[PDB]
Design a protein around this ligand. Structure first.
Ligand SMILES: *[C@@H]1O[C@H](CO)[C@@H](O)[C@H](O)[C@H]1NC(C)=O
Ligand SMILES: *[C@@H]1O[C@H](CO)[C@@H](O)[C@H](O)[C@H]1NC(C)=O
Ligand SMILES: *[C@@H]1O[C@H](CO)[C@@H](O)[C@H](O)[C@H]1NC(C)=O
Lengths: 445, 445, 445
């Protein structure tokens, strides 16, 4: 895939093109079970050091079970649960009489199995750990007699290893109120995640997509605690379904565009708004304003449509003609001429004002470009760093072509006296209407 | 408890009522000690594999102690320490001569004990781990001779288990500069937290409150590292005291309210401000603007009054009459007609504008409601999802009654030509004064 | 070092002086290697419990290696990688043919060694764990025969201890997409960090600085995963270089300054902007607007110049004469008279308006000061807490001198009718120009 960039000198903005999308649009919920042992404390006259170690690890198991019990009594309403609703609906089904018994029956002979619930949905269940078999077969003959039988040291170690995953899951669920994200390897192993991806009702190319970006899949997944009941600990893992694939995505970068007059206080500034990620989606454009809502791998963007706005496709015309009537291209105005830089995908935008020392250097050649007052841009081809004031930015060394689109900075088309200088989220046409109304008070005079 | 909702069509806002409060107003500090062993490295000609394992775990203990020492030399001033002041004041007392010796004496025979410090306060101390007894009784006869005695394999395992909590506490305190929140099970066990709640000078009903929401108590607690001195590692756990209980709490939801003219650029928008949590508190209302400052369980809100504003009780009249002179009901204005949705507690607000496809569906029936241009609302009774553009929101399936309060959208009472379209944090009466002043420039003409 | 404060009654702002700087200006990258064992699964008829435990831990090692392999295929472009560029450039060199073989040769006999790469830079390499020697010497004679040899129980335990660090590093790198910050003790031990500081090409006083603030150094460091290839797991640790040292730093605190008229809706408010940390840097001032970008220890501020603005040194004149023409001192305006408090370094600013109950108390004396309507200040000398409405703030008990600089609140110099009441990021002179233009519409009438 070819990554390209376009800096528009007229609007002090740059667009990084050539990225492919992966937008989350659905959820695939799955039930994860850990078969537990319903045991009560048993006392046999014991003093052997091995017996002591076993009883110690067994108390750590019983506290973990009671901790999971007090965790499942309190079921969280933290937030709008608008992104976990899919799994919360499964937990409400699991609380029905006979349903934990149902999953207990389907996973009686195999580890994984599809189960048709009574509410309806066809969930895929897994048995990832079997403590009921281990405690009842290897541990009860040790503690459930008049006098304790003596266990071998291999057993002490094997029980600390098996019980460890239960303890770590109780630790995470206790500090996070039953909802964890990302989903850790304790909640779901890479082997278990990959087998769960392979068993999903998705296309073969989409299974390849999730398997090559398992870390992004974990960051976009949730683990919700359901119930501990009748020797079963169940929790739902909610994995992302990417309904939008291989669509064009671009990233808009904006920087303040001011005039460069020599008398401070006589300068006016304009900045394009809505910087961030844009992706073509179902005849429209899905816009992502928060910076942390999109993880990028290679040329592919992984966004959650949960935190997007839906805009008309004409919003891209702000990149080719900011003055085009098909779309009201919004700006913000000020008189705050502070220098800054934006590291883009293939270069750097620099807004230099005042006495600020703006420059672009190569590690071995030194300063190769000095920016003047105004908004400018430099490609990463031959540039390693950019210094603005006392701050040094590193340029991304990604391969791609940059295009410098020359044009008059549009801030020069504005008369300063009638400029609206405190506008946040203003349209180009809105600013023009405030200027036409301010021109009428002068028309009479 | 009955959860109810009221959508006000006139102001594009909804109020979720019936929630009970738990506001944090005080702190209960407590001293947590780990009795350590003042040992220096001891060398005996040793090569036995068991002796090697013991010396390895002992070096991990000595590095943990030196790591805690370099952690306590640097005492943080990170932030205004305005919420840890209560515990920082105890750490300054612990540094006095004889005070670590005092706690060392009170916990000489029992694990928990109340101690009257020299500064004054009556703190409750605990001994959660005893490494001085274990290292000096089970380990020194092994390393403090000419030739090492041979330890049994149970001892190697018991020492890795006991030393583990010390190592994990040093790990958390090293990456977090001595202040951790929430308070982990390593800092304080659920058994230790529950016993600490039971031993607190609080009402019996309030102990029941903290014991049923231990995960929320952990998220609202702090663990502060004090000192390692004279075979004692001490750190203060600061637990929340909820001075406001069972008060009425409601959640205000707001969404943009625009006109629906057919020519873009001729539309004006209004949005109610100060969305969030409101709770009755001491004759006033405690308002919480940040979303993460309130954890909800069932019908109970758990807020920290540290991040609240105090407002007059007349602020609720913005919910019944936005035009009421007893309180200046604030709005923000714009010309940005972008579609969005808000998932409320019992339904969903939808602001639909332009060509956006807004709809509300049931999983098995399909589309059951199409929203028109404007601000509207749908209850969760029969609705599962709401789609706005390319985004799908899930509706909370919580039981409750919704009330649709019909009324003319107030944005229609405004003449567009004289509307103030860039107002952030503006009052209703403030906007009316800008309109009366803009009406005077037209009165003469 | 003497900490001092100055509250300016005229502008409702306070300045905390006497702090020394440590600004991050460079990066020191270092290569961290873990020598691994290229083994494939080996099967010998085995049933001994010790053999089973060893094969279990060996599968956990092989899954960790395959997990690191799928982690290094996906190389992240998450963000602008503008702060990890230095290490990402080293990872691209490590991928060259013969370079992992080069580091494998330089660390063949010693643990640490400086290596001149082919790209150029002179990196310092370390071998922190040696699994190739341990697996090939202690484990292969156990699994690579016709029938398995029987290992001793000390070996089972020693292998779970050595393999543990590899597993924890794979766990962190899997959930964080190869880039972790802060740098944990698993990524780099305190002993390894301190030895790495001692071996750095920095001044001896600067090594003392980083060694006494290792927790701040970890919070300002990055760990980047490079490659697993040819029995080598390599990742770069990027440590901060503090180019600005012992410079003057002050903290600006601002609070709303309103008029105290008795009729609500007739009041105007002004607040100084750009609150935060200021440090002298290279003839200018480095300003830090985000609150979490500066960690404070004692009297020293540790900032990253990556998130700073560079301002002229005349910006300090807003603290002595807000009306001074050398610098355009910016304010924001509103009519939102909401009470609040700011805990400063040596006292507290209180903006009290309306019916709000503002007070300052001592724990044992009770209320010692009642604030009137307006903006006021109290030193921490004799004050423990400050209550504003239903909120109680704790005052920092740091030793220092406070100075109350009396002056007329400048909001009283403004005629309310012509005040600009919706100004964000406005200069003093900008507001005066809007008043001169609004005075001309009245001049004719
Ligand atoms: C300003 O007036 C001119 C006509 O004189 C018109 O072409 C233009 O569209 C107007 N702009 C706005 C924003 O109303
Ligand atoms: C506008 O003027 C009318 C009187 O003509 C008055 O009733 C109203 O309160 C005024 N509004 C403001 C905000 O001053
Ligand atoms: C306002 O006018 C006076 C002269 O009458 C001048 O001294 C002052 O600088 C002007 N202020 C601005 C902001 O233009």
């Amino acid at each position: 895939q070819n990554i390209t960039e376009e800096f528009y000198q007229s609007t002090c903005s740059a667009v990084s093109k050539g990225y492919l999308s992966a937008l989350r649009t659905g959820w695939y919920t799955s039930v994860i079970t850990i078969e537990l042992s319903n045991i009560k404390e048993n006392k046999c006259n014991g003093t052997d050091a091995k017996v002591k170690l076993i009883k110690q690890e067994l108390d750590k198991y019983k506290n973990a079970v009671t901790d999971l019990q007090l965790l499942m009594q309190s079921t969280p309403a933290t937030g709008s649960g608008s992104a976990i609703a899919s799994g919360v609906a499964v937990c409400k089904v699991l609380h029905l009489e006979g349903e934990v018994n149902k999953i207990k029956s389907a996973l009686l002979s195999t580890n994984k199995a599809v189960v048709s619930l009574s509410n309806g949905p066809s969930v895929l269940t897994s048995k990832v750990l079997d403590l009921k078999n281990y405690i009842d077969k290897q541990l009860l003959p040790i503690v459930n007699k008049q006098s304790c039988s003596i266990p071998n040291i291999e057993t002490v170690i094997e029980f600390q290893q098996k019980n460890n995953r239960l303890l770590e899951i109780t630790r995470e669920f206790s500090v996070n109120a039953g909802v964890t994200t990302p989903v850790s390897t304790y909640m779901l192993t890479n082997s278990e995640l990959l087998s769960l991806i392979n068993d999903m009702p998705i296309t073969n190319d989409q299974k390849k997509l999730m398997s090559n970006n398992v870390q992004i899949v974990r960051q976009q997944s949730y683990s919700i605690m359901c119930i501990i009941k009748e020797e079963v600990l169940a929790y739902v893992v909610q994995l992302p379904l990417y309904g939008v694939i291989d669509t064009p995505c671009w990233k808009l970068h904006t920087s303040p565009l001011c005039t460069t007059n020599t008398k401070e206080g006589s300068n006016i500034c304009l900045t394009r708004t809505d910087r961030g990620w844009y992706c073509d989606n179902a005849g429209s454009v899905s816009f992502f304003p928060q910076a942390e809502t999109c993880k990028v791998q290679s040329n592919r963007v992984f966004c959650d449509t949960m935190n997007s706005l839906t805009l008309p496709s004409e919003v891209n015309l702000c990149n080719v003609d900011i003055f085009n009537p098909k779309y009201d291209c919004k700006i913000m105005t000020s008189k705050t001429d502070v220098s800054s830089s934006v590291i883009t995908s293939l270069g750097a935008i620099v807004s230099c004002y005042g006495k600020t020392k703006c420059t672009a250097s190569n590690k071995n050649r030194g300063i190769i470009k000095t920016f003047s007052n105004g908004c400018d841009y430099v490609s990463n081809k031959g540039v390693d760093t950019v210094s603005v004031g006392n701050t040094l930015y590193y340029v991304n060394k990604q391969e791609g072509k940059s295009l410098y689109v020359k044009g008059e900075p549009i801030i020069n088309f504005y008369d300063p006296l009638v400029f609206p200088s405190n506008q946040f989220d203003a349209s180009i046409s809105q600013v023009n209407e405030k200027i036409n109304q301010s021109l009428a008070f002068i028309r009479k005079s």
